[PDB]
Structure 1
Amino acid sequence: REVLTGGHSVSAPQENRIYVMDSVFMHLTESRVHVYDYTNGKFLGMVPTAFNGHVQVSNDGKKIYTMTTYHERITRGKRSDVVEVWDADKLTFEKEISLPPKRVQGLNYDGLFRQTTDGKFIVLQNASPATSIGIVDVAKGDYVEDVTAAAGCWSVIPQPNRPRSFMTICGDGGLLTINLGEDGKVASQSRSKQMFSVKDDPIFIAPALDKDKAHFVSYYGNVYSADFSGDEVKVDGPWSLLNDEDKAKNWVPGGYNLVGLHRASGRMYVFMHPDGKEGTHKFPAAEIWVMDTKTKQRVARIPGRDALSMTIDQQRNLMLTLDGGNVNVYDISQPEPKLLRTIEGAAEASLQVQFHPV
């Protein structure tokens, strides 16, 4: 009469989908990705990611990649660090790629688990606790390169204008650029001049990423830029997010994945709070500021709804914000963002949301 079936695909089209990475910190061995339709808040499905999973969607939109850690008996027994490849429409497991047992275990900053712009390599952060960048060749299904040159650096910023190049932020206040060969090994590298003072004006690692440049905000509300239109990265800054009135209430940035760039307009979005002082760099947003990176001026400010992380969709002119449990959807087609809806209870403990690529 009725019969329960499986083998089904996600009901909503890929263009409607977002991915909320739920760390489930209270039960961190059962982290997962929740898939939602941003147009109506419908829950579409999920992918389990064991202990402290990280997630990204393949640049071609066909697959979901996760990174996680298993042990034979969870809290004892042999460790297995892996990347998994899952089908994006079926939400089923396809392949496991073994990693060395030093993949980063940490909060879900975008830059810990990325891909080259051509989609041919997964690029991830290792910490043993010595740092290096790991390269996974997607076509081969293997780990292919420890980038030991990145020792003392942190996080991966892919260059959207080259197929197999990325940058990392180093302890000298500069950027190291790595250009991979077609075999996923380092072909060439370069190190920028010092961009920021590590001691005096530390930057948040989250980039506001353009096609050929990246902007970074600092603990004290300054902005730094790395231009990679050429082979050598040119760095600049600081310019201040703050006017005189802002300085009077001690406005500073705070959050995790706390900035975004709308590439067509050059507008940078930043989570901000007043009464800044030592130790407030991860505070929830009192406001979202919208900065014109060309004129170096603020063009809008709106209430932040306690958001901690965001992400931007270029084509649909959207910004998502996330306060740890709830996702807000904003229309950013004009300088002043407009709140469209809130998806309540999208996660228990998430600091990362991402769009399906379109």
Structure 2
Amino acid sequence: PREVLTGGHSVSAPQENRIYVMDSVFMHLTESRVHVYDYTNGKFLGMVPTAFNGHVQVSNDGKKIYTMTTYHERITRGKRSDVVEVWDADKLTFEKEISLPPKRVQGLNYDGLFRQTTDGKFIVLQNASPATSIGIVDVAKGDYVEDVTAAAGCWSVIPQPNRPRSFMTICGDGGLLTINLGEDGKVASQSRSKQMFSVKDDPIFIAPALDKDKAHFVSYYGNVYSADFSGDEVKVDGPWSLLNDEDKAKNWVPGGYNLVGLHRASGRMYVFMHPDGKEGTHKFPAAEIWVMDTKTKQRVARIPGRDALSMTIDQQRNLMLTLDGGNVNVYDISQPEPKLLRTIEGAAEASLQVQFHPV
């Protein structure tokens, strides 16, 4: 027989063409998975099973795929096993399982719940038991090395691109808590910023529009706040409005999940917006995508939202991907006005997160 079925193959397309769509498959959440696609032509390249409500990220060096999920000996009964798994990016094969205490966050795929330090040495994840804390996983040693309980009352992880192993979290007091890790993964020091926003009067979405040394956040009411960490202490400021009087008269407000993005080279910030906003519409699909110049604080463009809910930006290639839950839209954002290149239909059944393979 000339033809013989073989396995052990690598992803057919180069790494720079790949994107990862985290499909929660909410209708059957125990079978969530990551779908790998070629954004240049929309070809399905492969997938990684992630059991119950998996979360995913690609290693900074782009060699491995990190997943986080929960298992039970008998799925709906039996002992619980929360873990981080390491998979080879090219072969999409399981390589290593890292044990986690049974409290990793089980929830929708916001970027800030499963991240890694800038130097790629540690995986930083959110815990909820429901009491909150941040977990630290040493990649090299493949071990959970720290439980940042000082983050109790805070939520999500925001890595500081200008430091090797530091990250911030948003806390219930409306401020930011910064954590600096030692070379071993344990907390070396921490600092608290002054209040940035009013939790009760102007809550912000947790999704940051992250620059090299500062982060921008949008609020339920269309305001923009900032956290500058270029120095020792974090300096907070804001708000300034994304809306003019006409926008307000029509009740335009932000809406989505991973709803904002920052094109660092130009300072342009992208946000999903919808009209007729009111209490309870902060997760509404985008009616439009607004492009803001963070320097001049002016809106420079507004285009059809295609019902998008989440987005992600590729700095080098000047690309923006939007996701409406099942379809992925690819945009060229080299110019102020985004340009739609193509739409990948049926990329997932229920995804709120898509990511580019690091390049």
Inter-partner Cα distance in structure 2 for 1:221 and 1:231: 29
Aligned length: 358
Give how far 1:241 is off: 0.3
Q: Deviations over 1:228-248 (max 9, x none)?
A: 001210000000000111111
Give how far 1:346 is off: 0.1
Q: Does 1:291 align with 2:280?
A: no
Inter-partner Cα distance in structure 2 for 1:219 and 1:297: 19
Give how far 1:265 is off: 0.3
Matched with 1:345 is: 346
Q: Does 1:256 align with 2:257?
A: yes
Q: Deviations over 1:139-188 (max 9, x none)?
A: 10000000000000000000000000000000000000000000000000
Inter-partner Cα distance in structure 2 for 1:231 and 1:114: 22
Q: Deviations over 1:30-76 (max 9, x none)?
A: 00000000000000000000000000000000000000000000000
Q: Deviations over 1:232-291 (max 9, x none)?
A: 100000000001111111000000000000000000000000000000000000000000
SS of alignment partner, residue 59 of structure 1: coil
Identity level (%): 100
Give how far 1:317 is off: 0.2
Inter-partner Cα distance in structure 2 for 1:12 and 1:232: 44
Matched with 2:112 is: 111
Inter-partner Cα distance in structure 2 for 1:249 and 1:211: 34
Inter-partner Cα distance in structure 2 for 1:139 and 1:230: 30
Matched with 1:199 is: 200
SS of alignment partner, residue 189 of structure 2: strand
Give how far 1:95 is off: 0.3
Q: Deviations over 1:66-104 (max 9, x none)?
A: 000000000000000000000000000000000000000
Q: Deviations over 1:15-41 (max 9, x none)?
A: 000000000000000000000000000
SS of alignment partner, residue 320 of structure 2: strand
Give how far 1:200 is off: 0.1
Matched with 2:7 is: 6
Inter-partner Cα distance in structure 1 for 2:233 and 2:246: 38
Q: Does 1:247 align with 2:248?
A: yes
SS of alignment partner, residue 123 of structure 1: strand
Give how far 1:13 is off: 0.3
Give how far 1:206 is off: 0.1
Inter-partner Cα distance in structure 2 for 1:357 and 1:269: 20
Structure 1 residue ranges, 4+ long, deviating more than 3 angstroms after superposition = none
Inter-partner Cα distance in structure 2 for 1:221 and 1:299: 16
Inter-partner Cα distance in structure 1 for 2:249 and 2:195: 30
Inter-partner Cα distance in structure 2 for 1:231 and 1:299: 33
Q: Which runs of 5+ in 2 are unaligned?
A: none
Inter-partner Cα distance in structure 1 for 2:32 and 2:67: 11
Q: Deviations over 1:117-148 (max 9, x none)?
A: 00000000000000000000001000000000
SS of alignment partner, residue 29 of structure 1: helix
Give the TM-score normalised by structure 2: 1.00
Q: Does 1:21 align with 2:22?
A: yes
SS of alignment partner, residue 161 of structure 1: coil
Inter-partner Cα distance in structure 1 for 2:54 and 2:16: 24
SS of alignment partner, residue 294 of structure 1: coil
Give the TM-score normalised by structure 1: 1.00
Matched with 2:89 is: 88
SS of alignment partner, residue 262 of structure 2: strand
Inter-partner Cα distance in structure 2 for 1:145 and 1:14: 32
SS of alignment partner, residue 315 of structure 1: coil
SS of alignment partner, residue 247 of structure 1: helix
Inter-partner Cα distance in structure 2 for 1:100 and 1:48: 21
SS of alignment partner, residue 201 of structure 1: coil
What is the CA RMSD across the aligned residues, in angstroms?
A: 0.3
Matched with 2:237 is: 236
Inter-partner Cα distance in structure 2 for 1:231 and 1:284: 38
